[PDB]
């Protein structure tokens, strides 16, 4: 099982675990984030992951075709998943653009963020050592805000288009385009290095963080719950959708990946192994992130909740501070950002390939026989690059935050998971699904999967959605910038672009099918083959 290991190990460490989980945990007060995180994990995450893999293997086709075999009425789930992937690919690559910019900035004798004597730095800067010797600002934070981002006062001020970051996105997109068109992927002896290097780097960062003088307070903030105050809907949605985002579920890529295997594989063992390990690596890297934050709190003399930004830049603020505290910081900075680029590039390759397949399968005659696939791939990459340019401007950070919060996370993932589990448990039939699983892997799902799909996942998703609507709180960048109403409307438009697919497809297929309305629904609910 050792190479299976290396394959699916490349599989479960991604920008999600390293980057998204730490800042989401930090944003929700730390310890309080973990309780809904594990509740959603064991309630829905693993069962929905297993369910999606089972669909992918059962149909032996793409994520859009399977619903035709299962439930023709709810075929809109595949379109929702493919549009979720399409929106995710646009903004997920900006992280690699920032990583590329940091890596290019790392080719210096002294790291630019280790001290503040440069041009872009504000007069209020004080060295972290000297800050406790307040209106002062840490050099790393203002480097992230002013040199890389050049952050605008708000989303209403796009500002100039940062040319260096635009070229970084262009370089990353060229790498992706060449890899997808030429089929370049980690298949030779390089797979072992690609699978082991991220874990080695994370272990080094964890060791450095835990040995910091202020690590203990960071761990206390990371693990101590705050159920008395922090039980807002926001933490529940954030943890539940972080579970669904770390796994490639509700995106429709897991069905395609599962279709690559066969019934002889040890399904429901690989699923639990990969899911538990994927959550475990996130939980482990949380210790490193929060220990670095605790060291920052000890050094700067301020609370842990105030040391760094409550946003996507937590990874780009904490880790550079960690590599600053190691011998020869340039070497560790270069290694860390090479690791980050590889870790994000592999996932981006997988997502773009899945999108390309799920779109060419809708018209193979035109997109695979009437025209070369290279042209279609170039079209997809170019359109995504022009769309991603919107997050490169000086105010691009706000757009990226909105995209992360709405386009490929939040209520849309709960919507997709609820409709998946509802359809399979109730419309298609839990007994039928268990019988199919018996036919494929040899044993029934058991009470845990079945009761999860029937009750627990629908209850959790509906409860989170209703609790969010009842106790609604608007999105805010960091914890001080309030988005305008039009930006919130745009975010909800991004979410609804995925949510509305199911009702639209239901109504369209109802209209396009002949017969009485009762007969229309009854026939469109019948499985195929």
């Amino acid at each position, epitope marked *: 099982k050792i190479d299976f290991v290396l394959s699916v190990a490349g599989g479960f460490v991604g920008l999600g675990n390293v980057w998204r989980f730490p800042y989401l945990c930090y944003k929700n007060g730390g310890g309080a984030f973990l309780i809904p995180y594990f509740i959603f994990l064991f309630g829905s995450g693993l069962p929905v992951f297993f369910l999606e893999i089972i669909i992918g293997q059962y149909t032996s086709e793409g994520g859009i075709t399977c619903w035709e075999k299962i439930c023709p009425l709810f075929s809109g789930i595949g379109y929702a998943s493919v549009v979720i992937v399409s929106l995710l690919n646009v903004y997920y690559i900006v992280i690699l653009a920032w990583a590329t910019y940091y890596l290019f900035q790392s080719f210096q004798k002294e790291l630019p963020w280790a001290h503040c004597n440069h041009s872009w730095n504000t007069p209020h800067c004080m060295e972290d050592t000297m800050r406790k010797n307040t209106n002062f600002t840490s050099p790393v934070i203002e480097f992230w805000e002013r040199n890389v981002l050049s952050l605008s006062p708000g989303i209403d001020h796009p500002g100039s288009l940062k040319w260096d970051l635009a070229l970084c996105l262009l370089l990353v997109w060229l790498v992706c385009f060449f890899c997808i068109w030429k089929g370049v992927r980690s298949t030779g002896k390089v797979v072992y290095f690609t699978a082991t290097f991220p874990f080695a780097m994370l272990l080094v960062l964890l060791v450095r963080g835990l040995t910091l003088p202020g690590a203990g307070a960071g761990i206390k903030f990371y693990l101590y719950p705050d159920i008395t105050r922090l039980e807002d809907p926001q933490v529940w949605i954030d943890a539940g959708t972080q579970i669904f985002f770390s796994y490639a579920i509700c995106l429709g890529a897991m069905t395609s990946l599962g279709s690559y295997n066969k019934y002889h594989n040890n399904v429901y063992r690989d699923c639990m192994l990969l899911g538990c390990l994927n959550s475990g690596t996130s939980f482990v890297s949380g210790f490193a992130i929060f220990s670095i934050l605790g060291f920052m709190a000890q050094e700067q003399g301020v609370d842990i909740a105030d040391v760094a930004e409550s946003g996507p830049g937590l990874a780009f603020i904490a880790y550079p501070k960690a590599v600053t505290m190691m011998p020869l910081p340039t070497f560790w900075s270069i290694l860390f950002f090479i690791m980050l680029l590889l870790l994000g590039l592999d996932s981006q390759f997988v997502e773009v390939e899945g999108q390309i397949t799920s779109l060419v399968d809708l018209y193979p005659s035109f997109l695979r026989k009437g025209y070369r696939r290279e042209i279609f791939i170039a079209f997809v990459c170019s359109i995504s690059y022009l769309l991603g340019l919107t997050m490169v401007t000086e105010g691009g950070m706000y757009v990226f935050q909105l995209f992360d919060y709405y386009a490929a996370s939040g209520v849309c993932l709960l919507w997709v998971a609820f409709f998946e589990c509802f359809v399979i448990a109730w419309i298609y039939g839990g*007994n039928r699904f268990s019988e199919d699983i018996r036919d494929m892997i040899g044993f029934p799902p058991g009470p845990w999967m079945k009761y999860s799909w029937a009750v627990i996942t629908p209850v959790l998703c509906v409860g989170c959605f209703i609790f969010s609507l009842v106790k609604y709180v608007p999105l805010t960048y960091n914890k001080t910038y309030v988005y305008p109403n039009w930006a919130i409307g745009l975010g909800w438009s991004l979410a609804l672009s995925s949510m509305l697919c199911v009702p639209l497809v239901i109504v369209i297929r109802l209209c396009q099918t002949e017969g009485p309305f009762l007969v229309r629904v009854k026939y469109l609910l019948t499985p195929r083959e």
Partner: antibody
Amino acid sequence: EVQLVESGGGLVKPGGSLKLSCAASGFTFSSYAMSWVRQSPEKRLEWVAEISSGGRYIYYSDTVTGRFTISRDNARNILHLEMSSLRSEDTAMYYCARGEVRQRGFDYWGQGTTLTVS
Amino acid sequence: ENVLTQSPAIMSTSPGEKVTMTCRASSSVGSSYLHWYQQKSGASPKLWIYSTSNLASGVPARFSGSGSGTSYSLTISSVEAEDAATYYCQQFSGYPLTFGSGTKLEM
């Protein structure tokens, strides 16, 4: 998980037809797959047919695929095997076995019924 | 059809001594899809070992089994008069299902 009983065995002529029944008790018959296993007078065991829990998936041995039909009554909790053309080699002792988990084997075996051709 | 076979078709045995049996398959069976059944004379077969190592409910702890690929075996720590029965290996990996030739312990 207690009791399984076969019935319907008897003497028939070659090329005839016979229906075999297998009653189930002590467990939810609709939640477990059922399989028929055959023991020749030489005591050699041979698998015959399998029916899934809901009856949607059916498998047959290569030697009985064209002549044997397996069916179940989930409401009645009774398992039935139908033979349309009994050859000379079909004379044997028939068992109905519970095979819900392929990785665990046939948990329980019935008493069995003999079949003879003359 | 994956034909199975068992070597010691007839095995004369005496109480107390350790005994062993072997099962072989024409095709590579998964370790989780092979099972052993005991059948006393005049009685229906009973499940004995499943997943090549897991003893069934009624089998005493003296029994054991191991194997992989296309070669498998079953062993007895110390036989007894109550162990005089016929044992069949069976593969559950692919259809048609097949049973081994069977080994009957003479005592």
